[PDB]
Amino acid sequence: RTKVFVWGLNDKDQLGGLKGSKIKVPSFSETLSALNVVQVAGGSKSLFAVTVEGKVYACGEATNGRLGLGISSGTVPIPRQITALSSYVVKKVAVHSGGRHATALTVDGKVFSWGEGDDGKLGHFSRMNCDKPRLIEALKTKRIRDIACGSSHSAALTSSGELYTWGLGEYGRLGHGDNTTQLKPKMVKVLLGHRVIQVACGSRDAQTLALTDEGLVFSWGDGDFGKLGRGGSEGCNIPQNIERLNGQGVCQIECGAQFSLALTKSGVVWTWGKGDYFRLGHGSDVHVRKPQVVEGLRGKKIVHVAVGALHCLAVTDSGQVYAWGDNDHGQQGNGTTTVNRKPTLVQGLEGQKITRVACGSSHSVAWTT
């Protein structure tokens, strides 16, 4: 039994069956609460749920085959199972908040991809769209442990700790020492000798973040607005260590629209990048070019975080969700369309031990377990 709550933009029914288009208060999801979810994940006006059984459901805008349901034009208003993956136990779906493609990882380590095919982000040696999940052949002999997708590139890491990237090469977000597009997965050779345990991918002129099992965070790709975390705006196509975060116990990394976020094991949140519309959480909309602690959450032990395009969710260990950032479509959950300049307690979730959050482009999810 897992209760799932959604709010935010609903113009394409990306919330799985609620009336209205601006759900400004977290609303109980009948359909999603029924599935017994282990993960929810938001793309561009899209929503995916991975269930304990290992099945995947999808709803929202269907364009570019982003939902993987064998179509490419409508909206899918009620969460629908991705039958193409029904012979597999899926463990995780990786999709970006500004994303029109996704990947799914099985428990036995296989990676499928579907959706928009531009720049090779599906990893199939082509730029073709896949309306239905397709096995990434390049990785069949690799035991994949984690996956991520930006808007224009993808990543996957092995149980032994090697990171793979593929997709758009422009602005060096792939990390291979050049700006070349890769239509198949390619190993980030610079990071060999570090066991990479987590990776996160940005959108548009995108950054990439990696996390090693020693707590070192690396970044590379586009440098606009200081989302690389080393000051100024210079980009690089080779992973560099974000020195500010060493020794801090970073256990989760995320990439929204043009900014970066890190959570530590002690419960601290750091953000940096493009500040417009208050997506960083520091109470002003200025850019932050090296990681800064979200002060508005001192003393609250955050246990899970999620980012959308312009908003963030943080979950405390007592089951409270804090939101900050833009609110054009209600994705803050403060009952209005007013921006949350600071971390702001989310409304309508009392009596709920919320454990996990997720974000799409303009929508929000919180569930229990």
Partner: peptide, 9 residues
């Protein structure tokens, strides 16, 4: 903004 969705409803 390039990342602000629009409400097509």
């Amino acid at each position: 903004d390039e990342d602000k969705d629009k409400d097509e409803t």
